Amino acid sequence: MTVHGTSLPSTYRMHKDINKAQRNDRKLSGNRFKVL
Amino acid sequence: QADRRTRHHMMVDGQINPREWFNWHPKEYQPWYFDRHKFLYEQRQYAQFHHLLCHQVYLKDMLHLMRYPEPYTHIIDCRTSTQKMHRWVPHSLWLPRDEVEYALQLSADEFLDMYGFRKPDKSDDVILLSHNGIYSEQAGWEWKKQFFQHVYNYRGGTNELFGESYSDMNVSDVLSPWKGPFPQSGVFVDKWSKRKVLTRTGPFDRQYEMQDFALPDLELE
Amino acid sequence: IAYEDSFEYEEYIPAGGSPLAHHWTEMTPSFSYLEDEFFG
Amino acid sequence: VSLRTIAESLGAAAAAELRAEVERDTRDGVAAIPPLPPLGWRVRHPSGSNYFVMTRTLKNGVQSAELNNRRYRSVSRADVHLTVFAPFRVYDPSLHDPTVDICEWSSFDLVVQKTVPDNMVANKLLQPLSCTPQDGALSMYVCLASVNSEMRIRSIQLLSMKEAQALVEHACFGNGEPLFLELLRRRGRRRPLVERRFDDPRLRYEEVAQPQQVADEAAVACSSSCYGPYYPAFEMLMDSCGSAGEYSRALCYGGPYVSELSRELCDALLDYIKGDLGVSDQLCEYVCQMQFFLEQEEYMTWLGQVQHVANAVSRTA
Amino acid sequence: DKIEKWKAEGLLPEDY
Amino acid sequence: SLQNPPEEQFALPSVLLRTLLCMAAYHCTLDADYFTTCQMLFGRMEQQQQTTPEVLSAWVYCCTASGRVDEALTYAKYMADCSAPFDVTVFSLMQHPSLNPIEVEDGSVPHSAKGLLLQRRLGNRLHTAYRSDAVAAHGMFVYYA
Amino acid sequence: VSGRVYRRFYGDRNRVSAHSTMRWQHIGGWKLLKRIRRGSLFPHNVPLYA
Amino acid sequence: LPPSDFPENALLKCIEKEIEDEALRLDKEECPPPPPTGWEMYHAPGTSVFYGRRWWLPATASAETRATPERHTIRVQLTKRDPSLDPECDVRGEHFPFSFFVQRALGLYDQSIEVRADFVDGELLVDNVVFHGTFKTGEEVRYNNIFNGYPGPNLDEAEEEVLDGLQAWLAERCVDDQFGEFVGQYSVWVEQQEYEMWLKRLRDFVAA
Amino acid sequence: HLPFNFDVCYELGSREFTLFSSVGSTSVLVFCNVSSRRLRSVKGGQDRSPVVFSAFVSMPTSGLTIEALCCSSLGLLVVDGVSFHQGPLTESMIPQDAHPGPEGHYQGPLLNQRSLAEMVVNTRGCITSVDPFRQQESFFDGHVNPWNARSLRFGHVPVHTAKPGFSDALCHFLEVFGVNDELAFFVEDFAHLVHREEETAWTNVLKTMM
Amino acid sequence: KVSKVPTRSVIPADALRYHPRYSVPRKMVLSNTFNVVGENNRYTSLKLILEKLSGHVGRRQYKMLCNLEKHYDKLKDEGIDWHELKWLSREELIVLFDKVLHLTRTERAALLPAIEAKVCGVLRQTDSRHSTVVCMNRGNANHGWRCGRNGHTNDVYFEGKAKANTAAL
Amino acid sequence: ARRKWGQKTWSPTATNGGAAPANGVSAQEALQIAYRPMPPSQTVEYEE
Ligand SMILES: [Zn+2]
């Protein structure tokens, strides 16, 4: 709290909250066919 | 109204391609303290002008100078819109803000001819007012640009003296959501750097920091 | 013309598939309709 | 008794939304200025519509365009008629398919026709001019698109009165297309909408009925042409607004798929449309702005019609 | 003036 | 290094754009064939920044300083039909065909500020009773004189 | 193959069971494979990890 | 082509190049691909739809007195693809959609059984069986909608007696994997002949 | 179950049923086009296209006609778009017999964010592939070709998504004309009834052909 | 010899997903609070679904205007769960939305795609100990609207943990 | 000509250092690389 200004559980929560979009958006369903 | 989508081409990275090209890198920017509650020129983006901020005269100083005025403490009104002024601050002179950078360039005789009152000496106390104290702050910066040693600002001048609820109507220019900005339309930089500047991590209402370099953290794993 | 006698095997261009768009041969600007006015 | 308080709550909210919509775009009392079109373009937007049409006429061919005229100082052919139909169809394909890195996809069509005047003497009768409405009425329909403020061609179609005559008479073995003949059997006119003139400022006050005069110059010249009874089939073929014209142009060739063309033909086609023809990336970025501005203008008339409907119910009930 | 314009253009009609 | 939301990050202040276009108009006074590039410059700025009456009056001064009479007055008439006020500092700099505005805002020429204030007040007085196009035409007449 | 055997129970769906640790270490061959050297049999019904 | 009179020399010389190398190549055939027996191939020169047509007589049992002749019609629309979504969107797979009309004994959408099939990766994928006109059930059910007519369910979800009876009805009509290969071959020749006409018609427009 | 004053009109062979109402001088017309591909279950849980219909509210005292793009889900009702047309209910305005209504008019803002909420569920949308020419092979069909569907805004997502407190008043305004949740429960059950009778008649016609 | 790289003709789009090691990611078991289904554990699937339905959506991060998080407290005060919300009929949802929840017509429109699909409120395992992943598959009535896949069988509240034990709660 | 996705036409070698000779390029070979066929309507040429 003195040097870094936060604590490790709050640090883990902030790290989980800063990148919420590029962690999971969809389940990416469908099938990809071979085109060649 | 009704939550207009904006025509900027910022986008979050997908779930398929790897993260590449780390000579530009957006990350989320969170400062220490909130600054939105503060005065407009006491915020974060005006910190370098912190020594340029005029000293504050308060309401009780203004009432004391209303009752007992001094011959060379010049009270000067910096309000520009004549349709929004309804009362007269006592012992005040009208010098509107948008003319101040010309007005201090005149001689004393030309000041008297173009404003009807004498030009204040550079050792005289000057006290500025506005509706919120914003036009008076810019006028105080213009008065301190010239060598005026004692320049003071009453923040919230008319709105605390006469009890009005007005504003100086500062636009704080923000692009219309049809105006597409610079980095989308342009070949000023290569395609990898153009794709990596236009990406952001999260919603596009918050602030972000652009890194010019990055090295891999080999000591984690 | 076989593959080993080809221009693409003289460089390291593969035999079939997606074209290497960032290869230096594909980045080389061609104007073949003006070739008779310059090299003729 | 509840119909009055419901229609008055809606008519007060629509007046509150229309009030809060104007003050957002208003800056210091003066309203939001529309984006300016490029040089020579005259935009017409009908009231209560989904589209806006802009025209441009290059006299003496291509050589009087904007790019071919700028030079360094202090040291004939047939006229071209441009027409850019721009609907309000703007979407992003990254919502439905996250693998596609496209922020904005806006489609707009370009119709370019040519017209021979009487003043050109040099190359009059050395060959029959195929661009003339008297001879074929050949016209190029360039379907365009804007993919993240970058103009990409969708299709280049060459349509004449021949393939309009072919679709109506002998597209089958002895008959025309059964759907194209039926679509022409149901052609009702649209009610006249008053158009607004967001022209180029320099041509805003010079001539007003100039896109109307060149539209009726060709319509006279095509209906009394070598191909007479096939012009209603050609009007629906060149009609850019609706699904009957999109099916009619899909019965024609549709051009080659452009990414399969040679790289020399892809850059020479882009050098012709952007540089020579004048349909530029400045024009392409303006259409994405004008699709946004006139959507905002149509939202306010929509808010004015919610209030007008809700006030007419509460005074009746 | 916008409501004045839509009545002249016909977007706000009268009683049918 | 600090990226705001892009509606406010890539917006320059109108004072900056007015100063840039007034430098361009002073150069078009010195050399009219600059004007074409200025047109290209305007062709980006209206597409990137916000079309304000300040930058439109500066573009009217740009067209006037190049010798372009008809399109300058027609842009002024377009501002008048849009109810946009002509900028008074551009109206004063138009009738001062010296004094490139970087050293006017810097203030290295201390004299003729009375003339600048007189032209600004004359522009305000003319705008009280007329539209922007008459003020711009008066500025064009005095500049060409 | 190279198989691992743990002493305690970890089911395929959830960890709850009716066995103790001594029970499952006699079930899942942990005592067996601890006391068994090479050349002997190991059951295929015992779950193998990694 | 003088550059003072003609500013489009980058396109007119490139399109004159593209006329010759599309004709000087030896991989193209001058003759159309030979259709199977009975089929007559029509194609309007301007459009992108070519028609097939043949007559046919089914197998009729001895209890019936007369076999009525049929009218088989093939309708192929050329496939369109958008290059503006490339290189962002994936490569669209090449497939050859066509329509197969069956009319008993006079247009295309009156008293006709229409079946839509897709030739993809060397095989036919029958999609829908669309009816047009008044047909007998079991009453009379009329399908008079030609654009938004009821096309039937997709055959992945349809009942098993509907599937094997249809393929026996289709194999008897000589519509199978070898017939769909010809539609993949004839549409390539049609699109090639339209492309050289498109290059010829574009040079007349740009140079004018 | 049926609403109070609504006559049904459904002929076998067409996948359309039309409901009409008239109170006073105002006329209410509900048009639905049942999907042939696959429609979602009435229980909802377990290609599954939603039941989308249109409602035409004509009021000659106002001089405008209100077209409401509505989607019935789980028997309830959401309203996706509201547009205004000139004059009374003309015959050309209804998309019956595969001729569309008025073309090239402003469709309206988004009243609800239902389409953005379906992508959190990862429900498959109307747009199958990115390529519009890929889905234009089955032209003049709303369910498989969304780029020319009137009910799907021709693939366009508008600029403004209307305020919740404002457009809650608009949904309450239409419920007094019979565009309540009681109608959408009937349209959900009648679209499943048309989808059985169309598939049974198409099968039995196909049996007699072969 | 030149060996060809083994590919497939038909591949699901889930296999196109990215991993920084091009490998299978770690699936850490959930915390010890989820071992017994209780009143503290019941509504964590309801909370995350209402959290995702109000946040930003898509690659362009479209903000959902209707905030469905304000109705989370009144839903758990009634004792109704997300799995119990899927068991309610159509007539029981009109009573729940109008009387208790006071859901507006646009807030009802943003919640109905989550109820139309019958999303299974099962916390999926993830690489971290704190999991914010709910299985978005459509549930079936035979398996209690739990979608019946990956071990979500008719009482499974959390992936890797025990059943509901409805006699207790 | 027109290219297809995935199908390339093989072409023979000139057998002169490959496409770019690493050993060197003579004056007459570099003369053709000098006056390369740029379109002359948009090309400025200059020598001193
Ligand atoms: Zn599940």
PDB file of C-alpha atoms in Angstrom, chain B residues 77 79 81-89 131 158 162 164 166:
ATOM      1  CA  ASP B  77     -15.367  42.563 -15.240  1.00  0.00           C
ATOM      2  CA  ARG B  79     -17.752  38.866 -19.003  1.00  0.00           C
ATOM      3  CA  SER B  81     -21.917  38.365 -23.494  1.00  0.00           C
ATOM      4  CA  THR B  82     -23.909  41.565 -23.023  1.00  0.00           C
ATOM      5  CA  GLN B  83     -27.213  39.672 -23.127  1.00  0.00           C
ATOM      6  CA  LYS B  84     -26.220  37.629 -20.054  1.00  0.00           C
ATOM      7  CA  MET B  85     -25.186  40.513 -17.771  1.00  0.00           C
ATOM      8  CA  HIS B  86     -28.031  42.014 -15.754  1.00  0.00           C
ATOM      9  CA  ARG B  87     -26.402  43.765 -12.776  1.00  0.00           C
ATOM     10  CA  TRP B  88     -23.314  45.867 -12.094  1.00  0.00           C
ATOM     11  CA  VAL B  89     -20.589  44.764  -9.713  1.00  0.00           C
ATOM     12  CA  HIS B 131     -19.723  34.009 -14.324  1.00  0.00           C
ATOM     13  CA  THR B 158     -21.285  36.871 -10.740  1.00  0.00           C
ATOM     14  CA  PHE B 162     -25.610  38.235  -7.512  1.00  0.00           C
ATOM     15  CA  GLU B 164     -27.183  33.907 -10.611  1.00  0.00           C
ATOM     16  CA  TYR B 166     -24.987  31.227 -15.544  1.00  0.00           C
TER      17      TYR B 166
END
